[PDB]
Amino acid sequence: RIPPQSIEAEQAVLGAVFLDPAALVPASEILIPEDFYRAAHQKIFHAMLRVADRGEPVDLVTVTAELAASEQLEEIGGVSYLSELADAVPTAANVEYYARIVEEKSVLRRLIRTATSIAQDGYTREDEIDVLLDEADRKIMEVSGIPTGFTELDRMTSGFQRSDLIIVAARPSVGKTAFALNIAQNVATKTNENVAIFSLEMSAQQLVMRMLCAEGNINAQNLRTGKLTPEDWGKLTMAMGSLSNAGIYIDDTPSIRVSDIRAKCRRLKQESGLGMIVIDYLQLIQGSGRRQQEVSEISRSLKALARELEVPVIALSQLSRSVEQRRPMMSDIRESGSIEQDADIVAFLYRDDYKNIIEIIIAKQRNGPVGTVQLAFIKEYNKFVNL
Amino acid sequence: RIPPQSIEAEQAVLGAVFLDPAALVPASEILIPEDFYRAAHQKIFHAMLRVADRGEPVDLVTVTAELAASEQLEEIGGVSYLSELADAVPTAANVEYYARIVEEKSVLRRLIRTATSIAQDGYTREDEIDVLLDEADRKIMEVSGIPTGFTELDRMTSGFQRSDLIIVAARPSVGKTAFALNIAQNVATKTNENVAIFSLEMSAQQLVMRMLCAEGNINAQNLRTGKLTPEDWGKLTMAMGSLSNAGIYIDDTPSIRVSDIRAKCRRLKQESGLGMIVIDYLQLIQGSGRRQQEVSEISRSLKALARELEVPVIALSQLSRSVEQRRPMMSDIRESGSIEQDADIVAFLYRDDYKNIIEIIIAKQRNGPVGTVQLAFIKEYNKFVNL
Amino acid sequence: RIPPQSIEAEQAVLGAVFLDPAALVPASEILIPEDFYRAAHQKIFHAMLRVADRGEPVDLVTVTAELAASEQLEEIGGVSYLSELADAVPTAANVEYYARIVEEKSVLRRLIRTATSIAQDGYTREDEIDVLLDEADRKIMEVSGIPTGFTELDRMTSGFQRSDLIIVAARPSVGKTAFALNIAQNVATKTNENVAIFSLEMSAQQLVMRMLCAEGNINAQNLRTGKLTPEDWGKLTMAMGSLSNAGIYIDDTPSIRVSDIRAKCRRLKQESGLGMIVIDYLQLIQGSGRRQQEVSEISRSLKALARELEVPVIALSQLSRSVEQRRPMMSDIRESGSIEQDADIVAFLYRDDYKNIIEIIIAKQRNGPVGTVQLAFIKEYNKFVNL
Amino acid sequence: RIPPQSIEAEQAVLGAVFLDPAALVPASEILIPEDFYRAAHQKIFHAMLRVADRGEPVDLVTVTAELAASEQLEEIGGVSYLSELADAVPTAANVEYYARIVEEKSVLRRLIRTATSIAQDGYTREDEIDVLLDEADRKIMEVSGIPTGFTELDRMTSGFQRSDLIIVAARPSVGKTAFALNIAQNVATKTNENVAIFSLEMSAQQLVMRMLCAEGNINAQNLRTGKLTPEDWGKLTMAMGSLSNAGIYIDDTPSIRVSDIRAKCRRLKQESGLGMIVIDYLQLIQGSGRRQQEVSEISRSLKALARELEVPVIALSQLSRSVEQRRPMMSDIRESGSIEQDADIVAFLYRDDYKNIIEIIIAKQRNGPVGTVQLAFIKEYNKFVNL
């Protein structure tokens, strides 16, 4: 003690209102009744606000009436006290400055209260800690382009650029995961940039297995059922050697929230440098809770993630079973929107023959053309090659 | 105290008989003399019954005579008391209701007596217990590694080892039941070990039919629709002969709890010796009550079962419809966990072509590699063979 | 007093863990913290379990740390007490036996507690009783073929056999109720077996009216509007005479649960003998609560009912309006499953002409053929006759 | 004090039941246990009712038993008190009169209690008032044709008559609002009757703008974009002059409940006189809560409103998008019923050419023909004219 306060300034604020009713507007903007340290002043300010909300004139008579009806007049010192308040104001026009003093001392009391609260929790719960530090963080604050490797896709895009949200949608079995991994692999191994991969459905080793096969040309099923030709084995050592130098960071957390994604990428860019973010399908990202509105916020958040880290974000998406009812188009993700607006580039993967060829339909691109880029897919190595 | 009683109702029952002799029939049906709390009423009711059994009229005079001869008149209060009883009945026709009240309070006294008796025995004999609980039950009611046979699977596992919890998950129609039965059959017929099989969905004979077909190479549908080639019949006798020597113990109880499974296996190992436990799908095992938390406890309990009996436990599991949304992975049983941690080995069965070949994906193994072992399935015999 | 306990054994269990950390596994399997009579031992065992769940080594230091952070060290006697525990164990390897002693004395305390609780409720609530006895039952436990009469249907089935769940599905107005009643009537009047009929939609007398008409050939509408030919009346007396000798037990309870059905049939078989169970449509049986998952459990329960009482259970079912969209098939009850698996025999009733003939489609039969048996229906008597 | 009571009459009621069990029927009809001032009499009457609900005979013995089991015998004075009650009744046949005396004194106590409660709230909450008076109203009570102007529509209807609920349904853009306003305008300006208009979607001035244009022939868009020919302006002054004499009362409350509509019309008729009620679409009226059942009650209430004020009620309704799937019919509002029964006259507006002509389909009329009346619509003035 004693708690930071300014009775003189509190008195001047309330007084000002009684001298000029217009003074309540500036005061109410800066203060709420609870900012007043003295209980009587809280009750008085609250009476003023009530009268004001009714569109009734706020003066000594209506405030007196208001407090009389709420049985608070005597408790606050009567009309006689309201007179003193009116005598306690040097100039009504200075009400904002008086108000700021009251506010300043309210904020200080909140700082002291939350700080003490944190200190006490330190002795009590002991008994967690990780949560303690996070809520201590939380409570204190409250008191206040890139080449893709696919020459033909690079022509249209130029290629994937910083701050852009790129969405690659495809029906199951089309090969969207393989597509995203090829791009992530080409960027990390060919260029000097780091790629952050979030695989929510597929594990980290299960994903590396696919880019090892893709890298050194090893038959996928050959590893799965292993099997392995002695020289197909020597093919693996060269794949590892070249793939070890790449800046590939994988997070295989089953169902992350966007905040976790954001925080991890945040730390990575300022620690090692970041160039791309690839997320293995969006419909698996869980919201801030514990699903149409939920998915729009995630979409909106991924675009914000792209802008912040000045990096292209490639988010895979899955198409509704409408294509089969019809070649995919915008309406197939629009029934599952509103990813359509947030994405400055939307790409679909269509397989003409479900020719081991696959079509990459660029349906949306904010700065550049719209059309179909074509690539060949090799099932045995899980790769997309040029044409 | 005081013991549940109704003197008023007792008095009305006896009174009723003195007003209308026909009232004794309903009373005697519902009550015996001992149900009366007051000794005098027991003696009186007993006198009535005696007179009645002699085929003599039951009224105030004959009951008085009866009690006089048994030297009980004064003891029950004389004829003067018998008069009071006659004045204590509101309506003789309501005798059944009066009787039921007396009975109700007799049953309560028996409940209190037996419950107290059980409580006392708890402190005294201590000094048995198993008998105590059984008679407590009784008294309360009265008031009212191991080679698998599949060379390629044995390479990776080595094979199924003691104390391990092995989980074999597969979508319906893939052939998990057939797979588990083949292993159970190979172990019992080839090695000198005993296998305990729990089939909750399939009956004991229905399961033997499948391993008879598997054993001697008999067409499954041939038996189902029977049908049977004379020499396909001689094929059955050899199957039985060889299958009779095997130590196969089957329990086809519809939906057991884990405690029942545990107790049965417990007795078996120390009586004949136990080597494997196979349970036909986990989602059918019911909890300790009367379903996510429930399933975790069962999982946790099966692992404890494996450790206790130093035996591999093979628990079949069913996959969520997520695979079809995608080849199965850990997340497919994780939405139905938490079997993932308790199991030191998790295996999936994937059929490439739903090639009559089937893939056995070992997704988890605590001591050993992770990969895909491949086997061929024969629909006609319901068998898995090597490759 | 004093409550059954073993401080010595409690001390040895905790001590064992401090001597060999492996001792906690056997102890935790047998005991939970609450089994310990002494509060300090509960707190200590709970600290051990917490440390263990974190995958951290459980020894004197980590347990001391755990209790210090939960502010329980002094309360349990300090590290000095933890030392005594370590000195209180004769041999760490005997931990299971020490554990069982602790458990045994915990179970006894629960027996004493629940028994006392029952005794007290006996004096208090008095004021119910039927509920009292049932929960007293409940609480104490917790401390621990047939010829059908239709020659052509008998050919295929052979006929309805013990332990089989037979499901007879039909659209409204087809005549499934009449069909089930004819079978129930043929069995009871022709063979020496007892039939249990559950009619949830139709009353007991309303159902007897239909089998009286069927029995002695009395025009149904004739009774309904009565009406009655003097000799059609003498036809009724012969129907009653012959129908009185039959072992037909009817329960016309509006909407029973499966447990009530089971309990009644249970008592019946061991009291008079039971041969068949007929239930007038499944969709009316209410669940254990207060509807797809609910219906699967009922189905599963009826099959368990069949196995238990070694009796064929005939459960009528109603078809979805899909047939009219198309002759019924399995998919018509599959949208209302999962009765399809539990039933070892599924029969549909199809009327070619909605010929007063009706078709009985046996879509499923586990042991025997699949086909259509044909019978003639007589509207006037509500009967199915041969062909 | 002392609170209005009659112990003598209370005693006679209970006594009567003990003398003649039939006396409970009249007593229970007039009284509930709480009407008895004396606690013992409440307990006794409650015991009687319980015994009675069980279908058991209510006499001195069963009531004694009932109170003994609920541990209330001694508390009410024993069986000895029950005897006194039996002696306290002059004649059991007079039980209704005794009962009414008890009831009378119960009602008085409720009057005193609620009145006191109101008086106290007057000093406390002071601090609202409008709510106070309304609940004071509420609590005290608890203690206890027209020519349309369209000659062809007048032929069929004759025209809109008192007590009739008229429903005018139309798809958006057809012109139902304009239609209703024309009728309301014709009635008020031509005949000496008052029209009450409820516009929930459209404001009062926005609605007057449309009937000013309609009145004096002023181009609608001309006012909207104003614009205005000097003599088209003089056209406005004549429109106002003639429209000022009309008895048009408008309530443009966004989403009223039917009770508010009813109360306002109620006051209007007895204050100035009322002739018509027009409500701008029914689907906007909110229920008594905070939507199919909800809409039926509103419909039912509007018909009651028509009967009460002996006035035709014209409620606009909107059609489902079924017409476009097909000329509107009854089924288009039947999927949004049950307005179909309550309305004694249902009219649809169909526009042949969405000819600036519009069809008025009278689909229902309780007293009169069914057919199509045809009128011409002028978009520029928002008017319907004859033909």
Swiss-Prot record, chains A, B, C, D:
Keyword match rRNA processing: no
Q: Which UniProt keywords apply?
A: ATP-binding, DNA replication, DNA-binding, Helicase, Hydrolase, Isomerase, Nucleotide-binding, Primosome
Residues of the active site: 201 (nucleophile)
GO biological process terms on file: DNA replication, synthesis of primer
Q: Which residues form the SF4 helicase domain?
A: 145-387
- The reply to whether Nucleotide-binding figures as a keyword in the UniProt entry is yes
Similarity field: Belongs to the helicase family. DnaB subfamily.
| Domains (record comment) | Within the hexamer the N-terminal domains (NTD) form a rigid ring, while the C-terminal domains (CTD) form a looser ring; the 2 rings stack to form a double-layered ring. In a complex without DNA or bound nucleotides the central channel varies from 25-50 Angstroms in diameter. The NTD interacts with the helicase-binding domain of DnaG primase. In complex with ssDNA and an NTP analog forms a double-layered, right-handed spiral staircase with a small internal diameter; 5 of the 6 subunits bind NTP. Closely contacts 11 nucleotides of ssDNA, the 5'-end points toward the NTD staircase.
Q: What is this protein called?
A: Replicative DNA helicase DnaB
